């Protein structure tokens, strides 16, 4: 549709799994769009403890925040969850593109809209729920994601405890615990990195 047009103006680059697309702190001058693949938005603290802010899959834009105000820094790091193809565009050229057609901007903003909603919910969670609560919630969310696997007893997902730690913001041990706990309570199944959240569907 419009997208074809948009892309035809982007440069395209492949990023190998685990590589860094956006490096928090750098001058934001380009806009990215995920053609194929998945990636992880995350921020670290002084020591370096990471916190997963969000997972973005194909169709998503990345590093959009720099676009509206001239000369800002990337708001957070973005690591390639898997190997993935990415379309890039100078914020400049992109603005030009918008003049000829805001439909595209509409599309972009539309994502930020979503992203705000959720990140906001993220805040309320760290605010109101407890680890069991948050972990509980996330298993639901991860079950939502695309790479989720349809399973007889619900949804199946692969993700480490360390990871869920960085998602919900608690220790990896504590995740293991709350995880065994949820298994007793027969709510999820857990075999290594493979977890199955019953109840989905």
């Amino acid at each position: 549709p419009t997208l074809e047009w948009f892309l035809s103006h982007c440069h395209i680059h492949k990023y190998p799994s685990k590589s860094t697309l956006i490096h928090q702190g750098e001058k934001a001058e380009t806009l990215y769009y995920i053609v194929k693949g998945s990636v992880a938005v995350l921020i670290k603290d002084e020591e370096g403890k990471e916190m997963i802010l969000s997972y973005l899959n194909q169709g998503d834009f990345i590093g959009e925040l720099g676009l509206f105000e001239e000369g800002q820094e990337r708001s957070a790091w973005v690591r390639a969850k898997t190997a993935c193809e990415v379309a890039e565009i100078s914020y400049k050229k992109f603005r030009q593109l918008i003049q000829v057609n805001p439909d595209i901007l509409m599309r972009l903003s539309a994502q930020m809209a979503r992203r705000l909603q959720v990140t906001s919910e993220k805040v309320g969670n760290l605010a109101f729920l407890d680890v069991t609560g948050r972990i509980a919630q996330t298993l639901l969310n991860l079950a939502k994601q695309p790479d989720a696997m349809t399973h007889p007893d619900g949804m199946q997902i692969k993700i480490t405890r360390q990871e869920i730690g960085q998602i919900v913001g608690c220790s990896r041990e504590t995740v293991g615990r709350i995880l065994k706990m949820l298994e007793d309570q027969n709510l999820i199944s857990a075999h290594g990195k493979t977890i199955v959240v019953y109840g989905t569907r």
Binding site: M149, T150, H151, P152, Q156, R201
Partner: protein, 72 residues
């Protein structure tokens, strides 16, 4: 719905895939359609390529896998 009526073959998928659903007793796209990936994966001789295949054809035909629907 109209599609789930016609049999799987209409999906024009690879031999391997066919012979697999075939041997797994799948007849109509209405059965397959409501089958879990994890299951199909246990299916002998049905691997990632074949699985990814099934999903993609169902995806084009507008369907999903592990579909939900009562009375079949």
């Amino acid at each position: 719905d109209p599609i789930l009526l016609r049999p799987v073959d209409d999906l024009e998928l690879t031999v391997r895939s066919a012979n697999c659903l075939k041997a797994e007793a799948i007849h109509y796209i209405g059965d397959l359609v409501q089958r879990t990936e994890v299951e199909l994966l246990k299916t002998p001789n049905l691997g990632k390529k074949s699985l990814t295949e099934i999903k993609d054809v169902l995806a084009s035909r507008g369907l999903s896998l592990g579909m939900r629907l009562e009375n079949w």
